[PDB]
Amino acid sequence: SSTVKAANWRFVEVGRVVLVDNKELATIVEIIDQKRVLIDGPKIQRQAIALAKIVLTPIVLPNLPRGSRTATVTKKWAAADIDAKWAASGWAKKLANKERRSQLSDFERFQVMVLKKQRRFATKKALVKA
Amino acid sequence: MKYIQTDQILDIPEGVTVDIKARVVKVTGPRGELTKDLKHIDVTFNKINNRAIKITVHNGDRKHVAALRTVKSLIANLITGVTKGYKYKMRFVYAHFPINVNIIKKDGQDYVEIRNFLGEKRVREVKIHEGVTMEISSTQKDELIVSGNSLEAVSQNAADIQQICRVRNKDIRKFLDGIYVSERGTIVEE
Amino acid sequence: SRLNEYQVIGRNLPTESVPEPKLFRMRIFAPNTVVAKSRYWYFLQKLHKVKKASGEIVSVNIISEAKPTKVKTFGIWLRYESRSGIHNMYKEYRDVTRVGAVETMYQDLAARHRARFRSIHILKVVELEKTDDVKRQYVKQFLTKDLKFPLPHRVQKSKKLFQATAPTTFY
Amino acid sequence: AESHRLYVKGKHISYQRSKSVTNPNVSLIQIEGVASPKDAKFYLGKRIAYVYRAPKEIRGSKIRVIWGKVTRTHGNNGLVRANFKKNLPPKTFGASVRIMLYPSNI
Amino acid sequence: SSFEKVVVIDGKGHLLGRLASIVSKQILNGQKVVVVRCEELNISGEFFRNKLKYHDYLRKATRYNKKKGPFHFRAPSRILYKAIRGMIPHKTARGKAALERLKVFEGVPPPYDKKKRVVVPQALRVLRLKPGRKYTTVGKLSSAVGWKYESVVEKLEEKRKVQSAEYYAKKKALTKKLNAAKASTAESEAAQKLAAFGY
Amino acid sequence: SHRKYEAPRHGSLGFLPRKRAAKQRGRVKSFPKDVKSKPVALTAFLGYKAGMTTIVRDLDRPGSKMHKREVVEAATVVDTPPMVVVGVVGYVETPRGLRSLTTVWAEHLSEEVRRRFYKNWYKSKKKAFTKYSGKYATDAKQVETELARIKKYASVVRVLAHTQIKKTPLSQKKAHLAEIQINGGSVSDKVDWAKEHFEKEVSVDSVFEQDEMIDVIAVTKGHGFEGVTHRWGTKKLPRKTHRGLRKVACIGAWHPANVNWTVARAGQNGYHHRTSINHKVYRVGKGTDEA
RNA sequence: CGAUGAUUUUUGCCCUGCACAUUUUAGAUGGAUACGAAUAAGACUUUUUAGUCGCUGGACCAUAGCAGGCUGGCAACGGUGCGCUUAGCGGAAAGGCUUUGUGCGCUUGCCGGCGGAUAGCAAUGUCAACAUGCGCGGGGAUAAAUCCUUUGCAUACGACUUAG
RNA sequence: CAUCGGUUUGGAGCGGCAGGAUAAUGGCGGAGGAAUGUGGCACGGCUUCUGCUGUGUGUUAUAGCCUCUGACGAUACUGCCA
């Protein structure tokens, strides 16, 4: 066959889930320009934003009509359960682990070191025989 | 103006398998294989089916859009080169001095040797590019046939032969001698 | 600038001959009310035998966007001065606020015609309700059905000077 | 136990200066790992030590110290202004200083 | 943002002047910098344009004695060095010390062939230039103006990359074995607690 | 103002500075480019300028008015006894140029070449190369190790050879030792050729054939300090010029307010290093031939 | 900038294992932590259709013990430091990267017993790599250059080519 | 080191109050309308109709949107806090 390698880009389209401020989720509801979109979400304010200020996530909210108001976006977001889909990805998991690490205390860091010593002992023991 | 999207559709004949990976096109047909690097252009490819390939430019300005149909045409020339071939015919034009053209082989290399051009004692030699076949036509007097799979190589050999036979220090409107491309077609007639 | 749309209303000072002069309203795009009232008198003396000294400002009010989160297409009619003459032009902008389209216009004529704020008159700003009202192809290309486009070659901003891994531009 | 450091690494970058005139009474210090005025405000008021070696021993030691303190931030990239008891000599431009964790307010 | 003992920069794909300014501020502030693969550096603009600029540079020489004039160095590392030195107060003792803090090379000679090379994103050509613009490779500009050792460097760079590939294949193999050992000790008491701490 | 009339410059700016050569032995700046397909052979030879003579020769140049007719031509005799091979050097390609890796020497060096390494030979203990001569002790594996290093890493191989100056009428006893690059064959072939020729004589007939065109490297005749008139061939000033006439009248314009490097000045003339090319070999004579 | 020859019979020189004391530092204070290449691309699995990873190093390794002391036990047969030792690779400036066996330690993988005070509420509160000298110990080698006379392939004088 | 007084630079500072179209929005309710027309329906090209899809129709259906509006409730912005 032809065997053409295609790009795996993320598209600016109605229904794209985006991160805003590296904390909160929102979805694209309508495209303004090459540079600007209108975003909305359950926990964010409906606003016109520049695509440079947001990051497209690999998640699409399916069947979201163009220009949907806040109620429609919230209802379809709850139905598609976008929050759970986001929280199950390695991206959100790495963000959560970064936050959890940033909340450790000095005593907890000491415990982390001690447990790491124990796990390294076990790992070297397993590695030498395999 | 930054056109949002511009598209072109390749058409792949039945026996041809285009193959694109990282802007390196490899076209395979009954007549052989041809390859082309397009890394100097920002284009993306989508396989619609086995008979069509979409060529896209996203958010391209006037010149970058202009570089899109040329990509299409280059790949199309590759496609028709491995399924029909290319054939350029050259006619020998002289008023008095016959042009003596031979296909010689020196140092293991093929050359086109032009002698007696305008009576000159100089011997002109043109290297024959790889994948290009030269032939002295039997059906026509004073005709050279340049054929091959690659249109670029064939046309460039024809241009080399035409350019090496330029007339100097004369009225070229009067001294019309030279070797000129008379027919640009394909090996397989259609 | 960073602008607001103002409703400025003024009149000639009442005389014993004319004790209720006509009230004139203008829509002014100005950064603040000091420039809003300044621009008002600038245009009235282009249209009427009035001055700030012989006139009176009656009201200055901000005109807020009706639907600030609805994407619109605006047509703006302009009268600007170039280095050689005076020209009328019409251009179109996509935005959610009427003010933000005028702000884009000022950036755009600065960029494409070297036209400063002082060289521009806004004749009219109209929201184009029908898709057939859109004349310019640079905003008509965003009114097509099921519009999608990627953003190839993403450049990520780093907090550090040195990076230990190879750069990438996927997105 | 391989590490014993209780100070943050710093560098003496510059004096306070315009294009042509320098003010030795104020030093510009780069605290390691600080890249914004918000980060640098943790270190306001902390004591700074410039530790150096000298030819003559004083009480059996060839190590001398000039003490200072962080007074304010500088610019937008997390440099701070420091005030030392004796001005840091200009030869120390690029030399490392010690940003102490006291007076502590944690 | 850490203070490093030596920062070794892989110069491939870096814009000449942006890397030069960053390295100048680094060495002025007491940081030792090594730049390797200066033949893979980049200048914005087509090759012919930068070659014309270098020929403008070559025009300049002391009239009464050519030996006194500017010394036009042709090696890519020396082109980068000239760019950096123009950004340093090199006629003071402090600028001289800062320049002593710097080293520039063609290729990756020892001992840096077995050390870590970093990149500088603020000066990377693929991240800075608009994707359609034309650029020059300093290795090609150097050969066009007199540099003699282009083919020597590429022969030695291919030998280094063959050796560096053997390194990576070995390192990748031991990473695969260690990952399989860390998988065995997962869901253990130490591993479960470390997962609750974010590790 | 411009010159009233045009004239070419006096002398060449491509032979500056007109200073004394750093050494009396002319050094080969560039050797012939190596071709692997050729046999292993030397590219240079050292000789001594004996004198000039005259020959008579029939010219073979069709279209010339002297064709098939006798011409009388000046010729130079170069006394060239065979050179002795005593060493070999390996060179490595580096991004900074060729670099000598190792030098391997022969076991025995004659006294005339060991005098090369002395300023006061008669006052010396003559200790040169004695420990190195001991390096050949009963297995000579140090020498083989260095030769293997040359084979493994060198790209350019040059032999070390010295003249047998005792066979010439010169009263000088120091031999002249020079590096002569080996061309042809692989690096291993060159190293084997050099090793097998240690302490052997190599003749001119193994380096140069008759009718060859060869180049001559030498330091020219010294003339000492010379004025501009003969150093640079400038025009003598009129007879009635005050303070003398063997000068350059104007050594510069007012600006640049310096003397330029292109102006002819008095200085040392002759004793320069020159490379002279395309000298035809009319005869490679043999010392054993009585005719 | 490299290769190479010879390096004082003087108590002078070289190499090396220590031990002590000194001078210096453009500036140690856990670790410079090694593919290459593309960027309109990379890498996994099936299938070449599709899904997944990145979205920064806030990472990775190391990190507990009088600046880290003295002792005991358990579990493992691992980890690590040093000393010999085996083999291989590295010439771009290799002067480094691996590796075999062995011995002596330590081990915080787990559980114990004893010690630190008073430097007084902080005062760098002194802990490093490079160099040199000096005492020992073990090996090792045993020159030239200049002036002077001479030469004339050189030359104003220096310098140069020679010879002694 | 503490506390004070003078001057001064800050905080991802926190709270209360006022004004405006007594913000404009949004959410909820009602009425009307259209298309870059959702479902459906009727023809098609590739699909064992596997976000299948295209073109017509028409007006919420198996998506929605726009305009006007009714009663509430916030926030932004700008001020004030002895």
What distance separates the N and C termini of chain E? 23 Å
Give the terminus-to-terminus CA distance of chain B.
41 Å
Number of helices of chain E: 8
List the quaternary state of the chains. part of a larger assembly
| Residues in helix, % of chain E | 40-55%
**What class, by secondary structure content of chain B?**
alpha+beta
The total strand number of chain B stands at 12
> Class by helix and strand content of chain E?
mainly alpha
- Helix and strand run of chain B: EEEEEHEEEEEEHE
| Percent range for β-strand residues of chain B | 35-45%
The main pleated sheet of chain E reads as:
3 strands, parallel
**Rg of chain B, Å, rounded:** 20 Å
Tell me what portion of residues of chain E adopts beta-strand conformation. 5-15%
Shape, principal axes of CA atoms of chain B: elongated
Query: What order do the SSEs of chain E take from the amino end to the carboxyl end, as H and E?
Result: EHEEHHHEHEHHH
- The radius of gyration computed from the alpha-carbon positions of chain E, rounded to a whole number of angstroms, is 22 Å
Strand count of chain E:
5
Q: Can you lay out the helices and strands and say which pair or pack?
A:
The structure is cut from a larger assembly and holds chains A (130 residues), B (190 residues), C (171 residues), D (106 residues), E (199 residues) and F (291 residues).
Chain B: E1 3-11, E2 24-29, E3 32-37, E4 44-49, E5 52-60, H1 62-81, E6 86-93, E7 100-106, E8 109-115, E9 124-127, E10 132-136, E11 143-148, H2 151-164, E12 178-185
Antiparallel strand pairs in B: 1-5, 2-3, 4-5, 6-11, 6-12, 7-8, 8-9, 10-11
Chain E: E1 7-10, H1 16-28, E2 33-36, E3 42-44, H2 47-58, H3 76-85, H4 93-100, E4 102-104, H5 125-128, E5 135-137, H6 138-145, H7 150-184, H8 189-196
Helix pairs in contact in E: 1-3, 2-6
Chain F: E1 41-42, E2 48-58, E3 70-79, E4 83-94, E5 97-105, H1 111-114, H2 130-134, H3 141-153, E6 156-162, E7 177-183, H4 187-196, E8 201-202, E9 213-219, E10 222-226, H5 228-231, E11 267-270, E12 273-280
Helix pairs in contact in F: 3-4
The structure holds two RNA strands.
Subcellular location (chain D): Cytoplasm
GO molecular function (chain D): structural constituent of ribosome
Family (chain D): Belongs to the eukaryotic ribosomal protein eL33 family.
Task: Give the tags.
part of a larger assembly, 6 chains, C: 171 residues, alpha+beta, three-stranded antiparallel sheet, 3 helices, F: 291 residues, six-stranded antiparallel sheet, 5 helices, 12 strands, 29% strand, globular, RNA-binding, ribosome, Candida albicans, blasticidin s, peptidyl transferase center
